[PDB]
Amino acid sequence: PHRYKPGTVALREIRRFQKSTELLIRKLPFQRLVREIAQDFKTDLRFQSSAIGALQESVEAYLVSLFEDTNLAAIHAKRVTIQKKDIKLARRLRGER
Template identity: 80%
Template sequence: SLRGAVKKACRFRPGTVALREIRCFQKSTELLIRKLPFQHLVREIAQDYKSNLHFRSAALLTLQGASEAYLVSLFEDTNLAAIHAKRITIVPKDI
């Protein structure tokens, strides 16, 4: 072996790391959307139905958890539809 030789980094095939990250995020239960922007969105949508609504912090966290769980489920199904069509990239018709 040569002195001072640097070992070449292991390179994964395209998409391997992305799939690993997807599995990791699907398993995690932590919230991925930032809390404040989500809170602003909920309040903005609620304004359309009734003004001066107040939300408990636990209610907002519950809404966020349910929303993220729904989105994960939606994108899982979307990804399966793309794979079934022999595509890697998801398109709007997969949803």
């Protein structure tokens, strides 16, 4: 059988996301979760649907900013994975509370 290295999912999945800019996170569970975090401050809110699209690509943009900086902060320290000190230094340098 044909088989090639665990860990060499890298470059083919690199192009496999990179050609397409469709929204990564699956939609209506994400609707459920934003509905649930919103639902416990004030009543009877709805969403407009393109507002869900807006907050969806907002979390997409902020997450890709997050682990792009943890990616190069991981390679800052001769390291091949990301781990918890990497994301914690990202959340040091974030500047936003």
